[PDB]
Amino acid sequence: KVYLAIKRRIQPGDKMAGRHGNKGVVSVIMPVEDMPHDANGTPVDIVL
Amino acid sequence: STEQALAVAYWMFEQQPGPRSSTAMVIDSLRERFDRRFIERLPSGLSPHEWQAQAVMTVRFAQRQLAAHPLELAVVRAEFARGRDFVLGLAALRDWLKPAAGPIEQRAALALLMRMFRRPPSSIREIERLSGLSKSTLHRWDKEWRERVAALLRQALLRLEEPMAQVG
Amino acid sequence: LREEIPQTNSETKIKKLSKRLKLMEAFQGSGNKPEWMVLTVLPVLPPDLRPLVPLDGGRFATSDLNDLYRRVINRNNRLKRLLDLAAPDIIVRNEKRMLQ
Amino acid sequence: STGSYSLVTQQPLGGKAQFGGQRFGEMEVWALEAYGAAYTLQEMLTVKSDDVNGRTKMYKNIVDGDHRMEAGMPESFNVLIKEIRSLGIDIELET
Amino acid sequence: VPLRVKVRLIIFDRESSNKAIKDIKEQEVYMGEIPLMTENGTFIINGTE
Amino acid sequence: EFDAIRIGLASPEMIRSWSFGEVKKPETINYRTFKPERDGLFCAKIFGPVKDYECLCGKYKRLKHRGVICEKCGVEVALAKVRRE
Amino acid sequence: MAESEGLMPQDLINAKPVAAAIKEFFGSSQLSQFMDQNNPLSEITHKRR
Amino acid sequence: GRSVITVGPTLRLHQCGLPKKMALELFKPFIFGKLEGRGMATTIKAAKKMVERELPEVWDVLAEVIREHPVLLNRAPTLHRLGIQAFEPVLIEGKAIQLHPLVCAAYNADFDGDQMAVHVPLTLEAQLEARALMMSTNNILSPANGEPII
Amino acid sequence: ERVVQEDRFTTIHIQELTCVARDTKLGPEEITADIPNVGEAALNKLDEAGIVYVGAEVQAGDILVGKVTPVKDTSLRVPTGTKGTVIDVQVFTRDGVERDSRALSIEKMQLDQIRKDLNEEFR
DNA sequence: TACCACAACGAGGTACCTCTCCACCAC
DNA sequence: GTGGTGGAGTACCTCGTTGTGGTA
RNA sequence: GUGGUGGAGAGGUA
Ligand SMILES: [Mg+2]
């Protein structure tokens, strides 16, 4: 018997869910610029 | 093999059914895995639908390659392919070998070509009975047609041998 | 049944007689013979539709229909071979019952 | 696209593991007949599944670029016919 | 984990008392094997937890 | 084509008309000998060929006669799918 | 029917049924099932179920 | 085939997204036919060779056959004919099925992990039935009541 | 794109594939590297014992185990859609059957590890 | 004799995914 | 391996018909 | 001129 290792990168379609029963399927992965950014320049990662 | 490939393509076009997947015959072949001199080890070729599609691709490629010689393509269709393809090949062979043959003569020529193509009637006597022509004339026409068809088919096969190997 | 149906005006009996007439009329018009109801012979399913499949390691998996067929054939062979020697009547009727 | 089928009924197996095809459940066929679309229903019922002599030939047609789809006769129904006949019930078609 | 028990075969002559005292005592055979649930609350069967 | 599917009772006469044999052996294919048994649940005398266009002893391996029944190989050589009908 | 001299306690008992029952219970019971391990909370709640 | 849904807001109503691999798997006989026709396929073994290696050539013919071929879509619980609808697929890079947000109400399909089953009609008859009768544009009002459902 | 760039949600997946040595009544099977009708590059991926070298990236369809039937090949290939890195191989042999060089080597480093651990504990 | 309690048959949602596990005996 | 095969452990829905032996 | 899946059990998704 043999074993294999797979690095599953998260991609659109994968189901993501928080802790309060808030499920979700990742729709797209848009680049960092398109994310809404704070006046300080800090962008968010997730747009619920 | 090019000749084997052509034969298989014609056979798959004719026996298009593809057959139902078999049954506890599989168990026998599985009890042949054990058994011993079964010597029936599945060669593991292409899939049934895959093989049928392969035959179709081969037929299309042959039609494309032999397009420049309509008579050669018709002769190949008459010799190998069946159904409407065989009908078209026989019609073209009749129009070529016996262009101005009368309707009775055209029917006799079609019957002789069918007899050459292992199709009914299978006897020269039956051909004369259904046509009314002398046995000598029928024999002479058949001898000439067989030689002409063999030569044309050899020409087409020679033309395709390099193309078939280029297709594998 | 047709003669008797109107003789009695009671509802239940006339209902039963109506059902009898319906069955008899269906049989007569259908050309069906009631004696065929109790079968003397029965058909067998074609093998492909009741296949047994073996698995890796010499395991075989057989359909239920195959087991049922084996059982009934076994019991029929039992009947014939005990019958030709005129088995005791209790034993023969018992075997008839298990075959049924 | 195509693959092995069950030996009893020549229908795709049902597992992603078995490279199977989804089952057009009885509700799906109801939804299809709610539309006037019947040619597609007959296609998916007969030639896309359960037609030994139809699948091969429509493969031929598709690779030839034709979409003609000779109808055929599902083997699952003939299986039902065979088992009903084995139930001692006479079954036949009036031709 | 294996398991064995101690048993005694006590025959009698059916004289309504201590008759034919033949007490054959010996440790029994390995009566199966208990799966010995793991320290983490589970146990393994054929390599499967 | 066809039409007007029918329902009827089985007449033992027309049952025998349907039947291609009278199975007498409850046992089926031999595991030890990879073959079905005469009068078994899968007997070729009754149901048809295991592999398409073959006879029991392989006397007629040829595909030319698709309907003949060989002498030693009594079960008629024919198409393999016939095991379903 | 076996005499006290005729037999020994170890040969008297066949332990196959006990081992067979233990095995089928531990490998086939509705309650016995592959412990999920996708997340350490999953094992804890599975054992606490 | 089937996969999970993903909202495509850049999708026109008549069109839907489609993963590349599902497209090439489903339309495989069409790819074979086109490849043999245009000439980069002479034997089918070579055609299988290119489709398995996915040369840039195969994407062109794949897009061509997809171009005007309607595709058939349905969710798991189909409670009315709007539960199964036809679309004109659009190739996308991914493994999820992009769906038009307006049509989710008809499918009653949220993007909380719903899987969406796909089918393709083969005959010209079936494709015309899809485009003229089952296209998402065709069915706007509910069959239960004239109220719009998109 | 940060999360995929930062791999905040990337995960590791381990699945196993197993092969056994059967004893066809036709003739018993063996685990050999000499396989017919195979491209040499696939053999180069494999070892002389018929097993993939540990730590080899494997695309889909690549042969993994060297198995021979009569004399066809029952060699194992990774299923399509599966592509990763082989991290471990295990081999087990029935009593009365020889231990392959792979198993010999494996037992070798295991014995070395045990010896070193106990020697350090003594130390 | 027409109600009537009582017993038996017969139905009870789609689709998909993952795992394990499969008749006994027995000269 | 190749013939050969019978019961102590189990009973824990919920209507809705449909047919039946009992009483007014 | 040839192409390879039953049933049970458990869990899960919508
Ligand atoms: Mg949802």
PDB file of N, CA and C in Angstrom, chain C residues 14-80:
ATOM      1  N   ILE C  14     -76.557  -9.977  -3.922  1.00  0.00           N
ATOM      2  CA  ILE C  14     -76.571  -9.528  -5.306  1.00  0.00           C
ATOM      3  C   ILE C  14     -75.226  -8.923  -5.678  1.00  0.00           C
ATOM      4  N   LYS C  15     -74.531  -8.305  -4.722  1.00  0.00           N
ATOM      5  CA  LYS C  15     -73.188  -7.807  -4.994  1.00  0.00           C
ATOM      6  C   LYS C  15     -72.235  -8.954  -5.297  1.00  0.00           C
ATOM      7  N   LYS C  16     -72.291 -10.010  -4.486  1.00  0.00           N
ATOM      8  CA  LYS C  16     -71.441 -11.170  -4.731  1.00  0.00           C
ATOM      9  C   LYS C  16     -71.745 -11.784  -6.090  1.00  0.00           C
ATOM     10  N   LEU C  17     -73.031 -11.925  -6.410  1.00  0.00           N
ATOM     11  CA  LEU C  17     -73.415 -12.501  -7.692  1.00  0.00           C
ATOM     12  C   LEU C  17     -72.956 -11.620  -8.842  1.00  0.00           C
ATOM     13  N   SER C  18     -73.016 -10.302  -8.659  1.00  0.00           N
ATOM     14  CA  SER C  18     -72.510  -9.391  -9.674  1.00  0.00           C
ATOM     15  C   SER C  18     -71.024  -9.605  -9.898  1.00  0.00           C
ATOM     16  N   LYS C  19     -70.260  -9.755  -8.817  1.00  0.00           N
ATOM     17  CA  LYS C  19     -68.829  -9.999  -8.967  1.00  0.00           C
ATOM     18  C   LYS C  19     -68.570 -11.321  -9.680  1.00  0.00           C
ATOM     19  N   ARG C  20     -69.343 -12.353  -9.340  1.00  0.00           N
ATOM     20  CA  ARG C  20     -69.182 -13.638 -10.013  1.00  0.00           C
ATOM     21  C   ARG C  20     -69.455 -13.501 -11.501  1.00  0.00           C
ATOM     22  N   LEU C  21     -70.531 -12.795 -11.851  1.00  0.00           N
ATOM     23  CA  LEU C  21     -70.851 -12.592 -13.257  1.00  0.00           C
ATOM     24  C   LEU C  21     -69.762 -11.794 -13.954  1.00  0.00           C
ATOM     25  N   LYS C  22     -69.207 -10.791 -13.276  1.00  0.00           N
ATOM     26  CA  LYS C  22     -68.134 -10.005 -13.872  1.00  0.00           C
ATOM     27  C   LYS C  22     -66.932 -10.882 -14.174  1.00  0.00           C
ATOM     28  N   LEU C  23     -66.541 -11.721 -13.216  1.00  0.00           N
ATOM     29  CA  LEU C  23     -65.395 -12.594 -13.430  1.00  0.00           C
ATOM     30  C   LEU C  23     -65.662 -13.585 -14.554  1.00  0.00           C
ATOM     31  N   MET C  24     -66.848 -14.191 -14.555  1.00  0.00           N
ATOM     32  CA  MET C  24     -67.168 -15.170 -15.584  1.00  0.00           C
ATOM     33  C   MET C  24     -67.211 -14.527 -16.962  1.00  0.00           C
ATOM     34  N   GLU C  25     -67.809 -13.339 -17.065  1.00  0.00           N
ATOM     35  CA  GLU C  25     -67.860 -12.639 -18.340  1.00  0.00           C
ATOM     36  C   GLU C  25     -66.467 -12.253 -18.808  1.00  0.00           C
ATOM     37  N   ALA C  26     -65.622 -11.786 -17.888  1.00  0.00           N
ATOM     38  CA  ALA C  26     -64.256 -11.440 -18.256  1.00  0.00           C
ATOM     39  C   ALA C  26     -63.507 -12.661 -18.763  1.00  0.00           C
ATOM     40  N   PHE C  27     -63.679 -13.802 -18.095  1.00  0.00           N
ATOM     41  CA  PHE C  27     -63.008 -15.017 -18.535  1.00  0.00           C
ATOM     42  C   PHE C  27     -63.510 -15.463 -19.900  1.00  0.00           C
ATOM     43  N   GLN C  28     -64.828 -15.449 -20.098  1.00  0.00           N
ATOM     44  CA  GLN C  28     -65.385 -15.916 -21.361  1.00  0.00           C
ATOM     45  C   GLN C  28     -64.974 -15.012 -22.514  1.00  0.00           C
ATOM     46  N   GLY C  29     -65.111 -13.696 -22.344  1.00  0.00           N
ATOM     47  CA  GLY C  29     -64.736 -12.783 -23.410  1.00  0.00           C
ATOM     48  C   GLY C  29     -63.242 -12.778 -23.667  1.00  0.00           C
ATOM     49  N   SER C  30     -62.451 -12.887 -22.607  1.00  0.00           N
ATOM     50  CA  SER C  30     -61.002 -12.897 -22.712  1.00  0.00           C
ATOM     51  C   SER C  30     -60.461 -14.183 -23.311  1.00  0.00           C
ATOM     52  N   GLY C  31     -61.290 -15.215 -23.443  1.00  0.00           N
ATOM     53  CA  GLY C  31     -60.788 -16.498 -23.891  1.00  0.00           C
ATOM     54  C   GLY C  31     -59.797 -17.124 -22.941  1.00  0.00           C
ATOM     55  N   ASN C  32     -59.778 -16.675 -21.692  1.00  0.00           N
ATOM     56  CA  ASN C  32     -58.838 -17.166 -20.699  1.00  0.00           C
ATOM     57  C   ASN C  32     -59.381 -18.431 -20.052  1.00  0.00           C
ATOM     58  N   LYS C  33     -58.519 -19.410 -19.874  1.00  0.00           N
ATOM     59  CA  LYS C  33     -58.961 -20.635 -19.229  1.00  0.00           C
ATOM     60  C   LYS C  33     -58.585 -20.611 -17.761  1.00  0.00           C
ATOM     61  N   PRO C  34     -59.565 -20.692 -16.857  1.00  0.00           N
ATOM     62  CA  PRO C  34     -59.241 -20.644 -15.423  1.00  0.00           C
ATOM     63  C   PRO C  34     -58.310 -21.751 -14.981  1.00  0.00           C
ATOM     64  N   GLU C  35     -58.333 -22.908 -15.644  1.00  0.00           N
ATOM     65  CA  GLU C  35     -57.445 -23.995 -15.254  1.00  0.00           C
ATOM     66  C   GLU C  35     -55.981 -23.592 -15.332  1.00  0.00           C
ATOM     67  N   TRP C  36     -55.652 -22.575 -16.132  1.00  0.00           N
ATOM     68  CA  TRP C  36     -54.285 -22.076 -16.183  1.00  0.00           C
ATOM     69  C   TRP C  36     -53.878 -21.383 -14.893  1.00  0.00           C
ATOM     70  N   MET C  37     -54.832 -21.118 -14.000  1.00  0.00           N
ATOM     71  CA  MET C  37     -54.529 -20.370 -12.786  1.00  0.00           C
ATOM     72  C   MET C  37     -53.549 -21.129 -11.901  1.00  0.00           C
ATOM     73  N   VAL C  38     -53.791 -22.419 -11.690  1.00  0.00           N
ATOM     74  CA  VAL C  38     -52.850 -23.279 -10.983  1.00  0.00           C
ATOM     75  C   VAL C  38     -51.878 -23.848 -12.006  1.00  0.00           C
ATOM     76  N   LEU C  39     -50.629 -23.403 -11.949  1.00  0.00           N
ATOM     77  CA  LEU C  39     -49.670 -23.721 -12.992  1.00  0.00           C
ATOM     78  C   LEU C  39     -49.108 -25.121 -12.807  1.00  0.00           C
ATOM     79  N   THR C  40     -49.010 -25.851 -13.915  1.00  0.00           N
ATOM     80  CA  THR C  40     -48.334 -27.139 -13.940  1.00  0.00           C
ATOM     81  C   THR C  40     -46.839 -26.959 -14.158  1.00  0.00           C
ATOM     82  N   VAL C  41     -46.469 -26.010 -15.009  1.00  0.00           N
ATOM     83  CA  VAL C  41     -45.082 -25.631 -15.227  1.00  0.00           C
ATOM     84  C   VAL C  41     -44.969 -24.132 -15.012  1.00  0.00           C
ATOM     85  N   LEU C  42     -43.757 -23.677 -14.722  1.00  0.00           N
ATOM     86  CA  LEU C  42     -43.519 -22.254 -14.574  1.00  0.00           C
ATOM     87  C   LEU C  42     -42.272 -21.861 -15.350  1.00  0.00           C
ATOM     88  N   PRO C  43     -42.195 -20.617 -15.807  1.00  0.00           N
ATOM     89  CA  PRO C  43     -41.034 -20.186 -16.583  1.00  0.00           C
ATOM     90  C   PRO C  43     -39.849 -19.884 -15.685  1.00  0.00           C
ATOM     91  N   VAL C  44     -38.694 -19.737 -16.322  1.00  0.00           N
ATOM     92  CA  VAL C  44     -37.476 -19.367 -15.623  1.00  0.00           C
ATOM     93  C   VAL C  44     -36.973 -18.050 -16.195  1.00  0.00           C
ATOM     94  N   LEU C  45     -36.439 -17.226 -15.319  1.00  0.00           N
ATOM     95  CA  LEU C  45     -35.878 -15.966 -15.761  1.00  0.00           C
ATOM     96  C   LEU C  45     -34.616 -16.206 -16.583  1.00  0.00           C
ATOM     97  N   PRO C  46     -34.436 -15.462 -17.671  1.00  0.00           N
ATOM     98  CA  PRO C  46     -33.202 -15.582 -18.432  1.00  0.00           C
ATOM     99  C   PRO C  46     -32.006 -15.263 -17.552  1.00  0.00           C
ATOM    100  N   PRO C  47     -30.892 -15.966 -17.751  1.00  0.00           N
ATOM    101  CA  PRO C  47     -29.765 -15.853 -16.813  1.00  0.00           C
ATOM    102  C   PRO C  47     -29.196 -14.458 -16.682  1.00  0.00           C
ATOM    103  N   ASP C  48     -29.141 -13.683 -17.764  1.00  0.00           N
ATOM    104  CA  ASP C  48     -28.537 -12.361 -17.686  1.00  0.00           C
ATOM    105  C   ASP C  48     -29.300 -11.458 -16.732  1.00  0.00           C
ATOM    106  N   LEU C  49     -30.618 -11.606 -16.675  1.00  0.00           N
ATOM    107  CA  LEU C  49     -31.423 -10.785 -15.786  1.00  0.00           C
ATOM    108  C   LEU C  49     -31.352 -11.245 -14.339  1.00  0.00           C
ATOM    109  N   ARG C  50     -30.824 -12.442 -14.084  1.00  0.00           N
ATOM    110  CA  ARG C  50     -30.611 -12.927 -12.719  1.00  0.00           C
ATOM    111  C   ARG C  50     -29.144 -13.288 -12.517  1.00  0.00           C
ATOM    112  N   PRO C  51     -28.228 -12.389 -12.858  1.00  0.00           N
ATOM    113  CA  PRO C  51     -26.824 -12.780 -12.941  1.00  0.00           C
ATOM    114  C   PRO C  51     -26.212 -12.962 -11.567  1.00  0.00           C
ATOM    115  N   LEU C  52     -25.206 -13.824 -11.510  1.00  0.00           N
ATOM    116  CA  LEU C  52     -24.341 -13.945 -10.351  1.00  0.00           C
ATOM    117  C   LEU C  52     -22.973 -13.395 -10.721  1.00  0.00           C
ATOM    118  N   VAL C  53     -22.453 -12.505  -9.887  1.00  0.00           N
ATOM    119  CA  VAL C  53     -21.194 -11.838 -10.201  1.00  0.00           C
ATOM    120  C   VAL C  53     -20.136 -12.253  -9.188  1.00  0.00           C
ATOM    121  N   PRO C  54     -18.956 -12.660  -9.634  1.00  0.00           N
ATOM    122  CA  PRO C  54     -17.864 -12.937  -8.704  1.00  0.00           C
ATOM    123  C   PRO C  54     -17.051 -11.675  -8.441  1.00  0.00           C
ATOM    124  N   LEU C  55     -16.381 -11.675  -7.296  1.00  0.00           N
ATOM    125  CA  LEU C  55     -15.572 -10.544  -6.883  1.00  0.00           C
ATOM    126  C   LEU C  55     -14.132 -10.997  -6.715  1.00  0.00           C
ATOM    127  N   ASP C  56     -13.236 -10.019  -6.617  1.00  0.00           N
ATOM    128  CA  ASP C  56     -11.822 -10.316  -6.440  1.00  0.00           C
ATOM    129  C   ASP C  56     -11.612 -11.148  -5.182  1.00  0.00           C
ATOM    130  N   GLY C  57     -10.722 -12.126  -5.277  1.00  0.00           N
ATOM    131  CA  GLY C  57     -10.488 -13.057  -4.202  1.00  0.00           C
ATOM    132  C   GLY C  57     -11.319 -14.319  -4.249  1.00  0.00           C
ATOM    133  N   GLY C  58     -11.943 -14.625  -5.384  1.00  0.00           N
ATOM    134  CA  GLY C  58     -12.720 -15.843  -5.504  1.00  0.00           C
ATOM    135  C   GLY C  58     -14.094 -15.785  -4.881  1.00  0.00           C
ATOM    136  N   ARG C  59     -14.519 -14.615  -4.414  1.00  0.00           N
ATOM    137  CA  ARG C  59     -15.866 -14.438  -3.893  1.00  0.00           C
ATOM    138  C   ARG C  59     -16.846 -14.364  -5.056  1.00  0.00           C
ATOM    139  N   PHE C  60     -18.014 -14.978  -4.888  1.00  0.00           N
ATOM    140  CA  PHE C  60     -19.105 -14.867  -5.842  1.00  0.00           C
ATOM    141  C   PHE C  60     -20.323 -14.264  -5.157  1.00  0.00           C
ATOM    142  N   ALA C  61     -21.059 -13.444  -5.902  1.00  0.00           N
ATOM    143  CA  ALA C  61     -22.276 -12.813  -5.396  1.00  0.00           C
ATOM    144  C   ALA C  61     -23.422 -13.209  -6.314  1.00  0.00           C
ATOM    145  N   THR C  62     -24.390 -13.943  -5.772  1.00  0.00           N
ATOM    146  CA  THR C  62     -25.499 -14.465  -6.556  1.00  0.00           C
ATOM    147  C   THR C  62     -26.780 -13.721  -6.206  1.00  0.00           C
ATOM    148  N   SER C  63     -27.643 -13.541  -7.198  1.00  0.00           N
ATOM    149  CA  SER C  63     -28.921 -12.887  -6.959  1.00  0.00           C
ATOM    150  C   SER C  63     -29.847 -13.801  -6.173  1.00  0.00           C
ATOM    151  N   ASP C  64     -30.849 -13.197  -5.537  1.00  0.00           N
ATOM    152  CA  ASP C  64     -31.804 -13.966  -4.752  1.00  0.00           C
ATOM    153  C   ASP C  64     -32.578 -14.934  -5.633  1.00  0.00           C
ATOM    154  N   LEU C  65     -32.932 -14.496  -6.841  1.00  0.00           N
ATOM    155  CA  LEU C  65     -33.696 -15.345  -7.745  1.00  0.00           C
ATOM    156  C   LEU C  65     -32.974 -16.659  -8.004  1.00  0.00           C
ATOM    157  N   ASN C  66     -31.644 -16.622  -8.086  1.00  0.00           N
ATOM    158  CA  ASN C  66     -30.893 -17.857  -8.266  1.00  0.00           C
ATOM    159  C   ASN C  66     -31.069 -18.795  -7.085  1.00  0.00           C
ATOM    160  N   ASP C  67     -31.023 -18.265  -5.864  1.00  0.00           N
ATOM    161  CA  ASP C  67     -31.228 -19.098  -4.686  1.00  0.00           C
ATOM    162  C   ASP C  67     -32.624 -19.706  -4.694  1.00  0.00           C
ATOM    163  N   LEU C  68     -33.625 -18.897  -5.038  1.00  0.00           N
ATOM    164  CA  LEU C  68     -34.998 -19.387  -5.071  1.00  0.00           C
ATOM    165  C   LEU C  68     -35.156 -20.490  -6.108  1.00  0.00           C
ATOM    166  N   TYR C  69     -34.553 -20.294  -7.280  1.00  0.00           N
ATOM    167  CA  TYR C  69     -34.605 -21.303  -8.327  1.00  0.00           C
ATOM    168  C   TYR C  69     -33.932 -22.589  -7.873  1.00  0.00           C
ATOM    169  N   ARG C  70     -32.771 -22.467  -7.229  1.00  0.00           N
ATOM    170  CA  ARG C  70     -32.085 -23.651  -6.731  1.00  0.00           C
ATOM    171  C   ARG C  70     -32.966 -24.397  -5.746  1.00  0.00           C
ATOM    172  N   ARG C  71     -33.616 -23.656  -4.853  1.00  0.00           N
ATOM    173  CA  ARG C  71     -34.479 -24.270  -3.854  1.00  0.00           C
ATOM    174  C   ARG C  71     -35.622 -25.035  -4.507  1.00  0.00           C
ATOM    175  N   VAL C  72     -36.315 -24.393  -5.449  1.00  0.00           N
ATOM    176  CA  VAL C  72     -37.494 -25.031  -6.028  1.00  0.00           C
ATOM    177  C   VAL C  72     -37.093 -26.226  -6.882  1.00  0.00           C
ATOM    178  N   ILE C  73     -35.980 -26.120  -7.612  1.00  0.00           N
ATOM    179  CA  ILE C  73     -35.520 -27.250  -8.414  1.00  0.00           C
ATOM    180  C   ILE C  73     -35.139 -28.413  -7.512  1.00  0.00           C
ATOM    181  N   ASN C  74     -34.451 -28.118  -6.409  1.00  0.00           N
ATOM    182  CA  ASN C  74     -34.113 -29.138  -5.429  1.00  0.00           C
ATOM    183  C   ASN C  74     -35.360 -29.864  -4.949  1.00  0.00           C
ATOM    184  N   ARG C  75     -36.396 -29.099  -4.614  1.00  0.00           N
ATOM    185  CA  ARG C  75     -37.588 -29.715  -4.048  1.00  0.00           C
ATOM    186  C   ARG C  75     -38.360 -30.503  -5.100  1.00  0.00           C
ATOM    187  N   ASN C  76     -38.363 -30.029  -6.347  1.00  0.00           N
ATOM    188  CA  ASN C  76     -39.011 -30.777  -7.421  1.00  0.00           C
ATOM    189  C   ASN C  76     -38.301 -32.102  -7.676  1.00  0.00           C
ATOM    190  N   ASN C  77     -36.966 -32.079  -7.692  1.00  0.00           N
ATOM    191  CA  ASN C  77     -36.222 -33.324  -7.836  1.00  0.00           C
ATOM    192  C   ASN C  77     -36.491 -34.256  -6.671  1.00  0.00           C
ATOM    193  N   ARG C  78     -36.569 -33.711  -5.457  1.00  0.00           N
ATOM    194  CA  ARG C  78     -36.952 -34.526  -4.314  1.00  0.00           C
ATOM    195  C   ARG C  78     -38.298 -35.194  -4.546  1.00  0.00           C
ATOM    196  N   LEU C  79     -39.293 -34.418  -4.984  1.00  0.00           N
ATOM    197  CA  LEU C  79     -40.618 -34.974  -5.229  1.00  0.00           C
ATOM    198  C   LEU C  79     -40.568 -36.113  -6.231  1.00  0.00           C
ATOM    199  N   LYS C  80     -39.917 -35.901  -7.377  1.00  0.00           N
ATOM    200  CA  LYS C  80     -39.995 -36.920  -8.419  1.00  0.00           C
ATOM    201  C   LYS C  80     -39.361 -38.227  -7.959  1.00  0.00           C
TER     202      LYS C  80
END
